[PDB]
């Protein structure tokens, strides 16, 4: 459809103001936040996930930081 | 307001005990009631009604660029300050313009500039709050008579006979008696106000329609919207942007309209219409059916004695009955229609039970048109209608044997458990024991779990479903379910429910 | 915000003949969120249409209409004896709520003149010390029309009290009544009294005069 | 049935307050907001405002504000409009509806129309008007019947006990001083006069007047 | 904005067919696929992180069919 | 310079005429007169029937609903031709000069 899948970014060239710049940072963080905030009792057992399996410590996080990035809009 | 003929029939095993009952009901799906001494009885919503909306606020997704001005400014000037930012119809937006001795400065790479656009609003949406008071239920309630195929489809003709009623439930009134005339009166308690949540969410209107949406993701909409009152509206500037400025020259245009992206903000929105009073089609109300009331007459009747006729051939209801409509030729009426369910014909053995109990023909008239609708049971059996030579029969086959309908029972059991929330356990109906603690074990699990995490849509909780079946596989003894305690039902049960 | 106004004003037109009033809303895309309301002088009004398709329990099937955005339409084909009333409309979508300068459904018929009669002040009024000259002018129609008060050849305009009805409802014509006050000293130091009427129909004021002098 | 019954025709003065009763049936009263319309004096409808009436919240269109009120009563079902320092210029008849929301309403309230003005209860000056010669013009003479400087409202003024309705016009009264004069005028053949009776009857119960005047000739 | 964060869905009683019903399997599926169609040279590269760590097999493919649905759209 | 005309798209649309053929259970396909037409959008379906609406079966039925398709917007794309494609290039020398 039209509101995914959008021409971002051209990338050839273009040093310019292109029709959207500026909001392109708010495209995914600020919807998947919203998303977060709309479900935190998913966010209180999202992280628990990464905690579980593999006891390596810092790579659990790297479960986790992803994982509760796929949730949102799947 | 009757069964027939109903997208969704379902029905009501009495095992009497009680004259009340407590039921909860929907605008598509209709009851019947079948009890020993009390008639057939339907309930179902016509819709849900609301009085007074009162409205919440409203939002512009189409508006329309008019004005552009764009006050230039030298370099180290700092701010610039257009005129425009006085009135807040005026959209203001700072900036600069890159400047060499070519274009209206002295100095180079810099610049200050503040764009002003007055805001033009094309076209705006709209929302509503719904009072809990406000909110109405006209609930169709009929009880099985001597019907045709006309008055049975017909309201004001079995008001003549006393055999439907209508009637609107309100917080105010949520207890409503109604008399069935012959028949005796029942008496119907609902629960207006917690069918529903009148503040979970509101009514969007796009365009000239108007649609559901939650309250909080109502405020969560990422476009201008507006005060209740009159003027002076937030994030206007969404729906506008910006370009280079090359001297004076900067273009704020708008964007289009957004109702398509409305329309494709809406996904689960349930289309509404309107004209007086809103009627919402699935409906959500909790009453209870006090039959005490209700009774049977004509004790002292008999069999009617002469021949009859089919009015319209038989065929099946598809919800697991039967019904046919019967012409009786014979003058000797008002009398019991004799008619059975049988299972062969050298057995006269009734099998089949009666939906409609206790057909009877109205008036002496012949050639009287009744409609009576009966459940046969399983495999081959037989439509009888009177008794010796003049009876006429019919052969009938329902492939709907019990070890299907099992499953009927249990899977749409677990779908009846599914969407209800904690309200599934009403058709538990004069419980208490397993059926209260059934629902209170679930109430605080509906409560917590599967709404602590809810919002998750189709295949997000799908999806990690199977992931945390993998968690049932890496565990240890004692501790196996533990991991897969929300996995199996209430997370891939509704992923399986909607499919698509 | 947004300003209505309903055009023709005024509409002389026979029955049974389709009458499609040109409208308008300032404020933009209303969507729908259109009435009509007809309204008789001294009643409250009646709503037609809501929905801009859809007629309300009371008004009959003839009362129909199209439009959204800012332009709408009350589209009449069989307009009657009953239609005949003060035409209202009011808007919906933002607020306040409010109406257009309205319009009026008249039945056409044949143009016909005033008749005009003026009264001298009865004897009672001059022994209470003023004096009214009437000058009735009945069963004219269109509702277009003048009168003038000639005192002596000259027109006065003080005093003067102009009463006049509605299209009535057995011909369906205007009637006014026109009334000259003057105090009795004042009445008898003035001589011809008339009252010119002009009119579509008479391409000349009709001219009905008396002199205290005179009878 | 939804009927909108009003407080009827008020008579004020300007310095005064009032409180406009509307009276609803057919439905429960709370769950219909009352939409309140003035009508101009030039027969201009203008939007008062409604009362979100649950909950009991009136919301004005901003030129009415601070000067008027939506007041109710739940259990007799009776929506108030209190107005507060009349001023002459609202005289007008007033109107209430019952809420079907952002479609207005399908009914009409009975309406109630405030006079502001500061007179005295008067009888009518109900003068016989002789017609003269040039007042008889195809084969009918026109009598009439000047009503003058009554208040307050109505006056019936019917001919002969109004046995003859034939060419009786009877025409508005404006305001003179807080006072309506209004004329009358009989259309009957040049034979019926002066050979048939043919008296104005001006009846005025506001002033408990009933006038009997004849024409005579001259 | 209006693109994302869709009402879908109300799950409030609603036994209907509502505004989009079918088109709601065809959200992200598709509008991925066609992500990963667009960007066929990270899918070669993506599921071979998933066999570098852990050595645990199945679980390996855990961390690539949730991974490759991470890159699209973010 | 010249740019050729590649396709469109309608982006807006409205319904106008909408026209649904009810037919009973059993009756397989429903088929509406307006498929001849390409400007009506037609799509298969079904009511679900009892012996109150039109039929005299229960449980099944078809319908063909048809509406004529109008669009109220719609979007043009362009193909660039090669040789179509023109550039300004200015070029200057910096010799004696002034702000002007």
């Known amino acids: 459809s039209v509101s995914v899948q959008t021409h971002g970014e051209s990338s050839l060239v273009n040093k310019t103001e292109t029709w959207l710049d500026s909001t392109k940072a708010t495209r995914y963080l600020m919807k998947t936040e919203n998303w977060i905030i709309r479900n935190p009792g998913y966010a209180f057992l999202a992280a628990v996930l990464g905690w579980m399996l593999g006891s390596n410590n810092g790579q659990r996080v790297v479960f986790t930081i992803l994982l509760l990035l796929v949730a949102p809009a799947y | 307001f009757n069964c027939l003929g109903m997208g969704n029939r379902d029905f009501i095993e009495g095992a009497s005990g009680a004259t009340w009952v407590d039921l909860v009901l929907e605008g598509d799906s209709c009851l019947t009631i079948m009890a020993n001494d009390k008639p057939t009885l339907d309930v179902r919503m016509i819709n849900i009604e609301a009085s007074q909306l009162a409205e919440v606020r409203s939002y512009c997704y189409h508006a329309s660029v008019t004005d552009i001005s764009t006050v230039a400014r030298c370099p180290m000037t700092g701010e610039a300050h257009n005129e425009k930012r006085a009135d807040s119809s005026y959209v203001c937006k700072q900036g600069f313009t890159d400047r060499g001795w070519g274009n209206g400065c002295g100095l180079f790479g810099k610049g200050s500039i503040d764009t002003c656009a007055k805001f033009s609003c094309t076209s705006k949406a709209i929302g509503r709050t719904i009072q809990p008071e406000n909110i109405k239920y006209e609930v169709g309630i009929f009880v099985h008579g001597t019907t045709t195929s006309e008055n049975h489809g017909n309201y004001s003709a079995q008001v003549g006979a006393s055999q439907a009623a209508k009637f609107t439930v309100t917080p105010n009134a949520p207890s409503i008696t109604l008399k069935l005339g012959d028949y005796g009166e029942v008496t119907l308690d609902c629960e207006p106000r917690s069918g529903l949540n009148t503040e979970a969410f509101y009514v969007m209107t796009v365009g000239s329609k108007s649609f559901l949406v939650h309250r909080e993701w109502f405020h969560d909409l990422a476009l201008p919207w507006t005060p209740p009152s009159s003027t002076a509206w937030r994030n206007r500037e969404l729906l506008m942007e910006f370009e280079e400025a090359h001297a004076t020259k900067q273009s704020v245009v708008a964007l289009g309209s957004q109702e398509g992206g409305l329309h494709q903000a809406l996904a689960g929105a349930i289309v509404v219409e309107y004209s007086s009073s809103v009627k919402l089609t699935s409906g959500h109300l909790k009453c209870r059916l006090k039959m005490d009331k209700l009774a049977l007459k004509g004790t002292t009747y008999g069999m009617c004695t002469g021949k009859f006729s089919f009015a319209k051939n038989p065929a099946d209801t598809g919800h697991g009955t039967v019904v046919i409509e019967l012409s009786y030729s014979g003058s000797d009426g008002p009398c019991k229609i004799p008619i059975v369910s049988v299972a062969s014909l050298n057995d006269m053995t009734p099998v089949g039970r009666l939906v409609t109990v206790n057909p009877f023909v109205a008036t002496s008239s012949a050639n009287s048109k009744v409609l009576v609708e009966m459940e046969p049971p399983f495999g081959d059996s037989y439509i009888v209608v009177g008794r010796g030579d003049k009876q006429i029969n019919h052969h009938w086959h329902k492939a709907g044997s019990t070890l299907g309908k099992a499953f009927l029972t249990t899977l749409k059991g677990a779908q009846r458990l599914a969407a209800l929330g904690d309200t599934a356990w009403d058709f538990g109906s004069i419980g208490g024991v397993f059926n209260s603690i059934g629902k209170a074990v679930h109430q605080v699990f509906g409560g917590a779990f599967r709404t602590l995490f809810g919002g998750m849509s189709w295949i997000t909780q799908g999806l990690m479903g199977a992931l945390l079946l993998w968690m049932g596989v890496n565990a240890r003894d004692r501790s196996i379910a533990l991991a897969f305690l929300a996995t199996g039902g209430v997370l891939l049960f509704l992923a399986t429910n909607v499919h698509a | 915000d947004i300003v209505l106004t309903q055009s023709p004003a005024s509409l002389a037109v026979s029955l049974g003949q389709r009458a499609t009033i040109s409208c308008r809303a300032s404020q933009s895309v209303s969507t729908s969120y259109m009435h009509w309301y007809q309204q008789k002088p001294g009643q409250p009004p009646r709503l037609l249409i809501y929905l801009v398709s859809n007629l309300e329990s009371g008004v009959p099937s003839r009362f129909s209409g199209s439009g959204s955005g800012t332009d709408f339409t009350l589209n009449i084909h069989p307009v009657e004896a009953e239609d005949e009333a003060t035409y209202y409309c009011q808007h919906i979508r933002e607020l306040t709520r409010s109406e257009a300068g309205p319009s009026w459904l008249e039945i056409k018929r044949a143009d016909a003149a005033p008749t005009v009669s003026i009264f001298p002040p009865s004897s009672e009024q001059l022994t209470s010390g003023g004096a009214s000259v009437v000058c009735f002018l009945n069963n004219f129609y269109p509702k277009d029309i003048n009168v003038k008060w000639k005192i002596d050849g000259s027109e006065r305009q003080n005093g003067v009290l102009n009463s006049w009805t509605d299209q009535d409802s057995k011909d369906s014509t205007y009637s006014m009544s026109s009334t000259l006050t003057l105090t009795k000293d004042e009445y008898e130091r003035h001589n011809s009294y008339t009252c010119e009427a002009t009119h579509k129909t008479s391409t000349s004021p009709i001219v009905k005069s008396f002199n205290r002098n005179e009878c | 049935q939804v009927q909108l019954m009003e407080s009827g025709p008020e008579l004020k003065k300007p310095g005064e307050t009032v409180k406009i009763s509307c009276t609803t049936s057919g439905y429960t009263f709370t769950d219909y907001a009352m939409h309140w319309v003035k009508q101009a004096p030039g027969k201009g409808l203008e939007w008062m405002g409604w009362?979100?009436?649950?909950?009991?919240?009136?919301t004005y269109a901003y030129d009415f504000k601070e000067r008027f009120g939506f007041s109710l009563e739940t259990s007799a079902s009776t929506a108030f409009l209190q107005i507060s320092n009349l001023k002459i210029e609202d005289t007008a008849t007033y109107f209430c509806?019952?809420?079907?929301?952002?479609?207005?309403?399908?009914?009409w309230g009975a309406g109630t129309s405030v006079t502001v003005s500061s007179p005295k209860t008067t009888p009518p000056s109900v003068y016989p008007l002789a017609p003269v010669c040039g007042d008889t013009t195809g084969s009918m003479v026109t009598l009439g019947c000047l009503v003058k400087g009554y208040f307050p409202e109505p006056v019936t003024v019917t001919w002969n006990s109004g046995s003859l309705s034939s060419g009786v016009h009877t025409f508005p009264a404006v305001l003179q001083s807080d006072l309506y004069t209004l004329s009358s005028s009989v259309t009957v053949p040049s034979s019926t006069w002066p050979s048939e009776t043919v008296t104005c009857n001006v009846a005025h119960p506001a002033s408990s007047t009933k006038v009997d005047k004849k024409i005579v000739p001259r | 904005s209006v693109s994302v964060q869709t009402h879908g869905e109300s799950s409030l009683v609603n036994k209907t067919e509502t505004w989009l019903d079918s088109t709601k399997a065809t959200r992200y599926l598709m509008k991925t696929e066609n992500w990963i169609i667009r960007n066929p040279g990270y899918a070669f590269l993506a599921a071979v992180l998933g066999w570098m760590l852990g050595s645990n097999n199945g679980q390996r493919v855990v961390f690539t069919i949730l991974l490759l649905l991470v890159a699209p759209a973010y | 310079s010249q740019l050729a005309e590649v396709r469109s798209y309608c982006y807006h649309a409205s319904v106008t005429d909408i026209s649904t053929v009810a037919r009973c259970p059993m009756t397989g396909e429903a088929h509406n007169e307006k498929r001849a037409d390409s400007s009506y959008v037609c799509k298969q379906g079904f009511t679900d029937r009892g012996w109150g609406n039109g039929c005299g079966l229960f449980g099944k039925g078809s319908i063909d609903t048809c509406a004529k398709f109008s669009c109220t917007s719609k979007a043009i794309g362009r193909t660039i031709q090669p040789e179509n494609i023109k550039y300004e290039v200015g070029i200057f020398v910096h010799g004696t000069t002034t702000s002007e």
């Open positions: 509806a019952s809420d079907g929301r952002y479609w207005y309403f399908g009914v």
């Open positions: 009362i979100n009436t649950a909950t009991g919240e009136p």
